[PDB]
Design a protein around this ligand. Structure first.
Ligand SMILES: Nc1ncnc2c1ncn2[C@@H]1O[C@H](COP(=O)(O)OP(=O)(O)NP(=O)(O)O)[C@@H](O)[C@H]1O
Ligand SMILES: [Mg+2]
Lengths: 155, 168
């Protein structure tokens, strides 16, 4: 599980770096300059680039979900690699808008022992909120996890 | 044509760097170069590589292409081109499966160039080794310089020496 999580995280990080790379920004700026016969090809490029962006986003989402699931499984399957809870939390906080990640966290992270979340309790507590609470909302899941950790280790 | 001349100068520098190292000097790893003489901002003159033929002309020629001559039962070049252009406005998975289907019915026949041009086993081995070394060195140099648009009509192969020449 740890090896699969590491590989999925590496692929997701590579995709994220490609999205934030200066090459992507230069290509987008070139397309914007080009869009300002000529019409047919302009709309053709404005459709092909959108299709490629959608496919890349779908691949990134799939890799992120697989990495989060494998990290959760690795955490539940042992204690030697408890330090990777930092990576799991970083992915969860940086991808709080994804409903699948929040649902996976709600379904499986509650089985994870709470003492693994103790070192990063400051960062878990600093993200508490109310504006986006709900059945699959990130805030409600985070509040429930924090409350369960507090109940297990109040000290 | 000034860009071509600058690229030729960089290829000459790569050749000189490869020459002074004994590992590549022993293997004779060189880049084929042709003189480019720009004359104006719109017109120019450059060296014509005598004895060279485009790899696409040798491989996928409509009349006497290598694929047609050696594999008549396989898909023609026009059929593969049409199939690839049809799946252009489609999904990525459809593009991948179309490409795999085309590759299944299109087997490479480029190995016959040295067989039909160099009947002597010693000369055939020398030409094949020179071709492999030229391809490896040109590929590494192109990757280092970020060379692009390396399609079939932009690559020339010497008939006498079996060494790839990169143009455009
Ligand atoms: N230096 C050369 N030596 C020999 N043959 C050459 C050379 N340059 C071009 N050719 C031939 O000319 C053909 C056309 O290539 P080129 O002259 O670059 O025109 P083009 O394809 O229209 N390129 P471009 O003008 O940049 O769009 C090639 O397929 C070669 O057969
Ligand atoms: Mg050309």
């Amino acid at each position: 599980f740890l090896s699969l999580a590491r590989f999925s995280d590496t692929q997701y990080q590579r995709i994220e770096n490609y999205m934030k790379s200066s090459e992507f920004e230069n290509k987008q700026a070139l397309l914007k300059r080009a869009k300002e016969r000529y019409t047919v090809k302009v709309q053709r490029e404005l459709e092909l680039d959108e299709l490629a962006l959608r496919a890349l986003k779908e691949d990134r989402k799939r890799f992120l979900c697989k990495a989060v699931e494998n990290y959760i499984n690795c955490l539940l399957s042992g204690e030697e690699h408890d330090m990777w809870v930092f990576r799991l939390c970083s992915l969860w906080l940086e991808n709080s808008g994804v409903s699948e990640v929040n649902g996976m966290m709600k379904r499986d992270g509650m089985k994870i022992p709470t003492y693994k979340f103790l070192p990063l309790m400051y960062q878990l507590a600093a993200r508490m909120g109310t504006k986006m609470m709900g059945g699959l909302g990130f805030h409600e899941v985070l509040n429930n996890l924090i409350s369960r950790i507090s109940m297990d280790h109040p000290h | 044509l000034r860009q071509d001349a600058v690229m030729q100068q960089v290829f000459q520098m790569c050749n000189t760097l490869l020459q002074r190292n004994t590992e590549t000097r022993k293997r004779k790893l060189t880049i084929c170069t042709y003189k480019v003489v720009p004359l104006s901002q719109r017109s120019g003159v450059l060296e014509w590589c005598t004895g060279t033929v485009p790899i696409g002309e040798f491989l996928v020629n409509n009349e006497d292409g290598a694929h047609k001559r050696y594999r008549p039962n396989d898909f023609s070049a026009f059929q593969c081109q049409k199939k690839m252009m049809e799946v252009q406005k489609k999904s990525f998975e459809e593009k991948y499966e179309v490409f795999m289907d085309v590759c299944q019915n299109f087997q490479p026949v480029f190995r016959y160039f040295c067989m039909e041009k160099f009947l002597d086993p010693a000369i055939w081995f020398e030409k094949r080794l020179a071709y492999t070394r030229s391809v490896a060195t040109s590929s590494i140099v192109g990757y280092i310089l970020g060379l692009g648009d390396r399609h079939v009509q932009n690559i020339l192969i010497n008939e006498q020496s079996a060494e790839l020449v990169h143009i455009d």
